[PDB]
Amino acid sequence: LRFFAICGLQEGFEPFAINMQRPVTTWFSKSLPQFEPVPLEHPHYEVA
Amino acid sequence: APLFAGTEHRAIMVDSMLHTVYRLSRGRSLTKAQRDVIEDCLMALCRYIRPSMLQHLLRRLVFDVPILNEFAKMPLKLLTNHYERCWKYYCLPTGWANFGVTSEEELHLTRKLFWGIFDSLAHKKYDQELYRIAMPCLCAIAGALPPDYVDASYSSKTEKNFDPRPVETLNVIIPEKLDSFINKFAEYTHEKWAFDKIQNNWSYGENIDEELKTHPMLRPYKTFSEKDKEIYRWPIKESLKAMIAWEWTVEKAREGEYNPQPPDLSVVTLSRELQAMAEQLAENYHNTWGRKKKQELEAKGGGSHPLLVPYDTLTAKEKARDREKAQELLKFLQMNGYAVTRGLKDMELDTSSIEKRFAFGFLQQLLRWMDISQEFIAHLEAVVSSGRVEKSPHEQEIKFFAKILLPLINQYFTNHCLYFLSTPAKVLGSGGHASNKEKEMITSLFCKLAALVRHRVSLFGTDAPAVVNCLHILARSLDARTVMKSGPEIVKAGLRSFFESASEDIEKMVENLRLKGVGQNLTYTTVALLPVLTTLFQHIAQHQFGDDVILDDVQVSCYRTLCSIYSLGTTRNPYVEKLRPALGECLARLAAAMPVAFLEPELNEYNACSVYTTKSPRERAILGLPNSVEEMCPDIPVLERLMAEIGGLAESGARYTEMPHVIEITLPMLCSYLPRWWERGPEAPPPALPAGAPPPCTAVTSDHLNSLLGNILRIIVNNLGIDEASWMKRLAVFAQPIVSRARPELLRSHFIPTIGRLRKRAGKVVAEEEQLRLEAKAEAEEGELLVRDEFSVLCRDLYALYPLLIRYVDNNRAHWLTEPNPNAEELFRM
Structure with missing residues (x-):
């Protein structure tokens, strides 16, 4: 971290993954269209 | 009232309620307490109703308020509060969050309301209550209107409980060529109505009945009886006589080009001038229609028709229904080769989108009132100096300028400062950038106001602080770089003269302090020039205009002011100590x-x-x-x-x-x-x-x-x-x-x-x-x-x-x- 000491360290803030023995897993918004069930609360579309 | 928020699903009933409450407020034989209760209810409702639903109420207010009679006071406060609350819904391009964005018709109604109130207030005699109630409304409407909004339906003539009188068509005679046109368009309309039947599945028969799906008089135009020929020609006669009373000249310069066979007129397209004539044709059609409905209302002894509002006020879709008949008539005129000419200052203006911008007209009116201010300020100075007279021919104009214009200038150019500073390369504001002509006009306004104030702070009296505040706002909103780079010599010389006069006045103050003209110069400087000049220099330094604005004569004047102040700095005196x-x-x-x-x-x-x-x-x-x-x-x-x-x-x-x-x-x-x-x-x-x-x-x-x-x-x-x-x-x-x-x-x-x-x-x-x-x-x-x-x-x-x-x-x-x-x-x- 480049600026944690300058701002954040003295204020008591702690790094998000400070004591994590493995890198944090991430999820990204894949733009591949997928078929999913129509939500039961969809604002516009209703299936009966 | 709060429950009425989000009532879109019952918009028609809500609009009917608002109309009924407004009518109850306008009702007579109503005690003051009852009227107060009704007005309170209307205001409480309009506080929570969505801005989009209030369009129909605003349509009626546009017609009612401009008269600025006694009943007009409550609508003024209502509009003030509504626009102050929903300024985002009208101004911002994205629109007010969760409330959508304004429409072209709503913005057109807003401009109509603004200009009607402005003109009525300007022409009306001074009244303290009306001038105190209206000014907030004008400020709110101006803030709501986008600076660069352009009204599609602009009329240069801008002509005009309601007057439904149409033009005296029957009085004027009809030419024989136009009579032949009447017959031709008569069978054209017959064929179009036959095509309407064939679309509706209707055909020829013995009588009109829904189950029959037949019409009796659908015989070919050749056997189409004599009486119904007159029935169908009579509207055409009325329209042609209407254009003749309009003095518009129609000439067949060009040669004109059962089973329904109506010619298709969609190919024919009305130009700007043809569309203008057809707009006026629809206007006459609604005017005769409203005359008939007024006759019905007179027979009833009461009531008002919902569609009694003027044509321009009526929404486009409602206009369209009647627009169809007029546009088809004029398109057929063109197809027959008939050309209609009257001459339009509307062509004279042409597209001129920049001139159509709202801020453009606002600044034009402000400059005209600057000229009027010069005139009556000169008269006031002349009378005060000698030959005192209490007639004050320009008292109404003085009161208007002091009470309405100056607060309006302050509020408008405080709200839309960034619009006038944004340039096409870099846009400071949310959206839209002021034109070069608008920037030049605002610069001219600032220069003219400063020249007006020069050595007349005592004459302006208690309005001097307001004028100085307006000068501050205008200087802060003034874009000088573009004006200097590409601007008229007149405006450039005006701003250079402002700087030169400021330098001269500061030199005079310096020499006088070193030791009634001296007192006037000292008070004018200390009260207006030093603050206004300080604000202008701060604006230039902040926006980096310095390299562009302060060149040549401006540099000379700035040198003079600079080291004149510095020379005064050496001198010791009580006045100098106070001024330091x-x-x-x-x-x-x-x-x-x-x-x-x-x-x-x-x-x-x-x-x-x-x-x-x-x-x-x-x-x-x-x-x-x-x-x-x-x-x-x-x-x-x-x-x-x-x-x-x-x-x-x-x-x-x-x-x-x-x-x-x-x-x-x-x-x-x-x-x-x-x-x-x-x-x-x-x-x-x-x-x-x-x-x-x-x-x-x-x-x-x-x-x-x-x-x-x-x-x-x-x-x-x-x-x-x-x-x-x-x-x-x-x-x-x-x-x-x-x-x-x-x-x-x-x-x-x-x-x-x-x-x-x-x-x-x-x-x-x-x-x-x-x-x-x-x-x-x-x-x-x-x-x-x-x-x-x-x-x-x-x-x-x-x-x-x-x-x-x-x-x-x-x-x-x-x-x-x-x-x-x-x-x-x-x-x-x-």
């Missing part, structure tokens, strides 16, 4: 604005934004300019002479009384000067270094800024603890900008001893307070005021010094934290 703060602030802004390093003229020949460099040697001789920049006005000492003098005074530790001129005038000037010319001098960021760059015109470096800050701190500590030092806060405020660029050594050298002295004094004073607390009764009462005054002076000193320290701490906070600093630790301790 404002003069120093104006000087600081001028130094921040000037594009030429006046303090150091030896390196002027490198500077390109200088009068000497721009103008040829043969030039500047026609003007009264010295041959050498050094002589431009010598009194200003050189930059390094000034730096030496400030350091000498600081080391000598002279009090404020010893150098009143320095602390008040010179130090703010250097504080504004040093950062600007450092940014352009050596040690600066080199963006242009890769390209060929001449030597910097200035020699200012970070050393000068560090030394000036050190000397300022020395002066403050030397004057530390004085009974009365009001200059300390001004000096701190003026010295903030240079604080960023303080060398790390400054901490040890200056800050630690100063804060140490402050801590020592605080400790002593708290010890005195504790001793006082130990004492009681008269001993406690006595000395309480003494310790209180000591605390007050200590607080003054701390508020003078800490603002500089905070900025210094921020820049060096990161370095101090990265590398431990005992100096930082000791400063924290103190």
Whole structure:
């Protein structure tokens, strides 16, 4: 971290993954269209 | 009322309720309490109804309010509150969050309301209540309207409980060529109505009946009876006679081009002028329709038709229903070859989108009223000087200008300041940028208002503060770079004359102070010119217009003002002592604005934004300019002479009384000067270094800024603890900008001893307070005021010094934290 000491360290803030023995897993918004069930609360579309 | 929010699913019923409540409010034989209750209910409803649903109510208010009668007062407040609440819904392009965005029809109604109220109020006689109620409404509507909104349906003529009278068609005769056209369009309409039946599955038969799906009179036009020929031709006769009464000339210059066979007119397209004639045709059709409905209302003895509102007010979709008949008639006229001409100032204007912009017309009206202001101000001055007369022919215009226009100018150019400053390259505002013509018009407005105020602050009386505030707003909203680069010679000369007159007035004030015209000049300067000029220079410096605006004659005038103020600074007098703060602030802004390093003229020949460099040697001789920049006005000492003098005074530790001129005038000037010319001098960021760059015109470096800050701190500590030092806060405020660029050594050298002295004094004073607390009764009462005054002076000193320290701490906070600093630790301790 480049600026944690300058701002954040003295204020008591702690790094998000400070004591994590493995890198944090991430999820990204894949733009591949997928078929999913129509939500039961969809604002516009209703299936009966 | 709150429950009515989000009632879109019952928009029709809500609109009917609003209409009924408005009618009840307008009703007669109603006690004042009852009317108050009705008005309160209407206002409470409109507070929570969605802005989109209030369109129909606004349509009626557009017709009703402009009359500005007694009943018009409540609608004014209603519109004021509605527009103040929903200004985003109308102004912003994205629209008010969760409420959508305004539509073209709503914006058109808003402009109609604004201009109707403006014209009615301008023509009406002065009334305090009406003028107090309307002005807020006008301000709210103007703020709601987008500055660059262009109305698609603009009429130059802008002609016009309701008058349903149509044109006297029957009175005028019909030409025989137009009668042949009448017959031809008669069978055309017959065929179109037959095509309507064939679309509806209807056919020919013996009688009209829904189950039959047949029409009796659908026989071919040849066997189409005589009576129904007249029935179908009569509307055509009325339309043609209507155009004739309109004096529009229709001539068949070009030769015209059962189972329904109607010719398709969609191929024929109406031009702008044809569409205008057809708009007026629909207007006559609704006018006759409303006349018939008025006859029905008269027969009933009461009631009002919902569609009684004027054609332009009526929404486009409602207009479209009747627009179809008129447009088809005129398209057929074109197909037959008939050409209709009347002549339109609307063509004369042409598309002219920039001129159609709302702000454009607003500024045009403001400039016209500036001219009227010049006229009646001249008359008022003439009568006041001699031959006093109480008739005051222009009393109504004076009251309008003072009460409506000035607050309107203030509010409008405070709300839409960024629209007039945004340029196509860089857009400051949310959306839209003012045109070059609009920028020129606002500059002309500012110049005209300043000229109007010149030496007439006493005449304006209690309205002088409002006029000066309007001048402040206009100067802050004034974009000068574009105006100077590409602007009419008239407006450019107007702004140059403003600057030259300001310089002349400041010279006169300086000489008068050095020692009724003198009093008038002094009061006008002190009240309007110095504040307005300070604001203008601050705006130029902030927006970097300095290099572009202050050139040539403007540079000459700025030189004069600059060193005229500096020369006044030397003189000692009570008036000078009182004026010193404002003069120093104006000087600081001028130094921040000037594009030429006046303090150091030896390196002027490198500077390109200088009068000497721009103008040829043969030039500047026609003007009264010295041959050498050094002589431009010598009194200003050189930059390094000034730096030496400030350091000498600081080391000598002279009090404020010893150098009143320095602390008040010179130090703010250097504080504004040093950062600007450092940014352009050596040690600066080199963006242009890769390209060929001449030597910097200035020699200012970070050393000068560090030394000036050190000397300022020395002066403050030397004057530390004085009974009365009001200059300390001004000096701190003026010295903030240079604080960023303080060398790390400054901490040890200056800050630690100063804060140490402050801590020592605080400790002593708290010890005195504790001793006082130990004492009681008269001993406690006595000395309480003494310790209180000591605390007050200590607080003054701390508020003078800490603002500089905070900025210094921020820049060096990161370095101090990265590398431990005992100096930082000791400063924290103190």
